[PDB]
From a paper:
The gene encoding for ChiP is found in most marine members of the Vibrionaceae, emphasizing the general importance of this OM diffusion channel for chitin utilization. Here, we report X-ray crystal structures of VhChiP in the absence and presence of chitooligosaccharides.
The GlcNAc4 substrate occupies approximately the positions of GlcNAc-2 to GlcNAc-5 of the GlcNAc6 chain, suggesting that the central positions of the binding site provide the most binding energy for chitooligosaccharides (note that the subunits of GlcNAc4 are numbered 2–5 to provide consistency with those of chitohexaose). However, there are differences of up to 5 Å for individual atoms between the two structures, especially at both ends of the substrate (GlcNAc-2 and GlcNAc-5). In most cases, however, this does not dramatically change the interactions between the sugar and the channel. For compounds of four GlcNAc units or larger, the central binding sites (2–5) are likely to be always occupied, in a manner as observed in our structures.
Author numbering:
A (entry chain A), B (entry chain B), C (entry chain C): 10 to 350
The structure:
């Protein structure tokens, strides 16, 4: 009656993650600086459940996962539900890869976040931007997604379509599709992705977004590695207005024995609308990080970063368009731990 | 120190469940049709915890469970708490069955939902209806419930009382009791249930509800089986008003090797108030379903159904009474998977 | 491949806890008495996850925990998130004890709650009180806390600082520190604790709180034991106003074979502001309890208690200051079960 690994039909896994983060804002209001700024803890720990199952009457193996959200993030209250993060059912087969239904990363977002948002570059490059509509969804419910196998060990595809944010609550007809591709060439990976979003309702208009990206990731054999990524966002509104905005992120790393130094910079350039650039609509961030490989399953890290955000713009409804800079410019010093089980 | 099944004092269990569902509404408003309609995913997966414990100083075995809600249902946001579904402590004894305290199905609801709400018949027969007050609570917190053993293998009783919805938040004195009974007669099961609800506050009045039901479930030995159920709902308001409404649900199945075809229809008939029937207060649904028994622990299914809801009524406060048809008539095509561990 | 306790990197633990509680309010409004009063179930069950990990490159052992909240308490809806209760990362070392970052009890609160809030004394002694500002935070996110070893088996320290409630959402600059100390002297424990809270915003003012306490806990060898605790709370407001209020809690127990009888009383005395006592700002509670040790891992209990709260006061903004008595005086009869795994 002695249990083995096979007696279970699930596994519990987790990312235990804690960032002690001190921010210093310069919004231009002293009180707002005190509120937003200060030390907080950013407990991004999470628990999840997942499993496989070989159904007796269907060859492609059944797969599932249910992942909790961040338990106690900064700027937020305690407590997370099961299902807030990647949460899906699906099927896998050697010859065609896998397909997932539910809550997953869009193919684009996955590349935007990794490598291109790390470390701390996300306020600018992840959710930062001044463009109307929806540049791309991130983690998204009501999504079906195909991950191809690595054809010839060189090549692979990520493809997805899904429902919008309003559609997932029966409050609109918004939807999107997108695709991404990955090519291994010697020590390089070349990445490309697209995502289109349709029927996005915003600022008294219906929008269509088209967002494209390419990037490279390289590994020298002496512990040096890097990435750069370029990202081009267009949006078109039901009243005729066009908007274009681009952006870039780059990172440099040196990994030597148990240590990794990392330098990262990312920026959105000025937004254009109907071909007139809008002044001071750009943002950037520089970030420096030292990381220690404290165990095969864990890391300690220290990090400083400096965000200069855009200094405001109006959306097409004659009202301030919220952006990742509405709360103001800020610097941040942080130390942290992450453990994987 | 090699673990056995007995080293644990809990078990993790789960229903992994995904429905890809396309709806097509005919509310009479085009925009409302686009919003509510379209494809969505209905991730009704859930995780739970449960255990038994033989207390050294008390014979009747201790039992408990804590079950999470649906992680990412359709028409809803992601994330569910532990405790949203059946969540209780209790005791069990061979000679008197079991008793549970906490969050359970009312004895009536359990019969309303199974067999009588499946497949897709619930908008009409589960929460559908035009009657005032509370026809019956469904899953309900603050409930004690006795499940009798199967006396003589033929016969058994389900009995419960509990607090109301307002009472569970110290905002009223609402409560209910009810009871259900089950008799095996050859290849049949005969069911009966009652539920009374008292001090229900609604539409500027205090209500009392009394709801009765009977049904049959039958198994031919050639893979043919069926159910029918009749349900009679009365409500009385503190100002004198009487209301009566009845309803019926029936289902037909043919289960042959690894397949099951299913036909289901259910309807609420026109509501009566103070003995005047009100025109067009009825609803119905027809539903067709093919199901494959893809593994002992899983099923795939395809399903189409058509809901015609009532076309509106006023409650006793001179204001639209919300019903399962306020959002409008709709059809639905669906395919799905459910796995049990 | 036969699992042992060591094959896991986590353990699931739980407190399964159910209280059937009848309250009888005397607010002075009959309807309010019916709402708040009545029978309810108080499911304070909770699940948690925790583990240890010896990192290969860092001596002090890594520790973590993630604990869910109460699944279905009384006066509340069903469902709790992971992380609502003690939820942290940390490190431990034989020579310096342990340090935790995240969501923990303040050193004071831990003593306020145990022994001094039990049984049922918390409406008075835990969150009860009329004093402005924040007397002390309780379970608190954004906290670092050091627990010393038991130096010389006699002596130990609990020390902590953390961010405020507004600060944990970037809506203010509120913070606190405090400390507590524990001395074993024959059959006694002597306790002392402090907590200071700063930049608390309330009633149109900024406050500073200082709260001090001492107590004793004693064990006779015949199953008799007791506690008493005194607690002195001061608060100072940005406009000059001073406020002082003190309080005491005591409990008596007799534990004989499988049984424990318990008597507890606690009270807040009248509040003083700028040296004028305010009439009828005090509260008390007496509570009686019989508890049976139904298993090494479980208890049954019955309990009756009587709360007489203060009869109202204004805060410095000329508006009722909410207190644990705003809802009115009430008595409560309760029976309950608690199981530990
Ligand atoms: C420190 C380190 O090494 N961390 C790695 C992780 O960071 C990494 O995963 C990513 O972690 C970042 C860390 O902050 C996390 O950041 C959050 O991102 C979401 C985007 O979904 C933001 O949500 C938006 O924010 C504002 C709220 O004010 C909204 O207005 C905005 O519109 C939101 N988006 C939408 C569509 O509405 C959060 O606010 C943000 N955190 C903040 C502000 O503090 C990423 O989400 C993580 N992404 C992923 C894909 O995992 C992880 C990889 O798994 O690995 C760690 O090592
Ligand atoms: C689907 C299938 O293939 N198999 C079975 C499961 O479905 C079955 O459990 C039942 O599953 C259905 C599936 O949709 C579920 O439906 C939900 O029921 C609740 C009941 O309270 C509804 O709540 C009401 O909804 C409306 C708004 O939508 C409110 O206005 C109304 O007032 C609510 N009730 C209140 C306040 O009291 C949900 O809306 C509804 N889902 C929707 C619309 O998508 C059943 O409740 C499930 N029943 C049970 C007992 O769990 C499962 C059970 O184990 O077994 C499969 O065989
Ligand atoms: C009961 C028993 O036999 N044994 C022990 C447990 O009880 C013990 O933990 C404590 O249990 C009590 C109830 O049994 C619990 O009471 C709740 O405490 C919280 C404090 O966070 C209250 O919160 C306040 O409530 C009101 C809402 O009306 C607010 O207005 C007020 O402002 C709240 N707090 C704040 C910060 O704003 C709850 O309302 C209250 N329950 C009620 C009213 O029913 C204690 O919190 C429990 N102790 C803790 C969390 O440490 C347990 C501890 O491990 O173990 C048993 O020994």
């Amino acid at each position: 009656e002695y249990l083995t690994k096979d007696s279970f039909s699930y596994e519990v896994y987790g990312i235990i993650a804690m960032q002690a983060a001190y921010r210093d804002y310069d919004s231009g209001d002293a009180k707002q600086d005190d509120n937003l700024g200060g030390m907080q803890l950013n407990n991004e720990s999470r628990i999840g459940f997942r499993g496989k199952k070989q159904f007796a009457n269907f060859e492609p193996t059944f797969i599932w996962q249910i992942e909790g959200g961040y338990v106690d993030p900064s700027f937020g209250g305690e407590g997370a539900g099961l299902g807030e993060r990647d949460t899906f059912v699906g099927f896998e087969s050697a010859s065609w890869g896998q397909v997932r239904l539910g809550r997953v990363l869009t193919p684009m977002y996955e590349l935007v976040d990794w490598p291109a948002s790390n470390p701390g570059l996300g306020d600018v490059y992840d959710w930062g931007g001044a463009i109307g509509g929806a540049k791309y969804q991130d983690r998204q419910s009501n999504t079906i997604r195909w991950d191809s196998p690595m054809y010839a060990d060189k090549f692979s595809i990520d493809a997805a379509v899904g429902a919008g944010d309003k559609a997932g609550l029966g409050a609109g007809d918004d939807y999107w599709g997108g695709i991404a591709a990955h090519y291994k060439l010697g020590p390089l990976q070349l990445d490309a992705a697209y995502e289109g979003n349709r029927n996005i309702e915003a600022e008294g208009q219906t929008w269509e977004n088209n967002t494209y990206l390419v990037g490279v990731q390289g590994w020298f054999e002496n512990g040096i590695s890097f990435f750069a990524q370029y990202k081009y966002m267009e949006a078109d509104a039901s009243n005729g207005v066009n908007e274009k905005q681009d952006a870039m992120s780059a990172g440099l790393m040196y990994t030597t024995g148990d240590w990794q130094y990392k330098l990262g910079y990312a920026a959105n350039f000025d937004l254009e609308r109907d071909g007139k650039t809008l002044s001071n609509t750009s943002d950037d961030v520089v970030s420096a990080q030292i990381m220690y490989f404290v165990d095969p399953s864990a890391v300690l890290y220290a990090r400083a970063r400096m965000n200069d955000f855009n200094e405001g713009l109006d959306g097409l409804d004659d009202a301030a368009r919220w952006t990742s800079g509405t709360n103001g410019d800020y610097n941040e010093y942080s130390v942290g731990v992450e453990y994987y089980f």
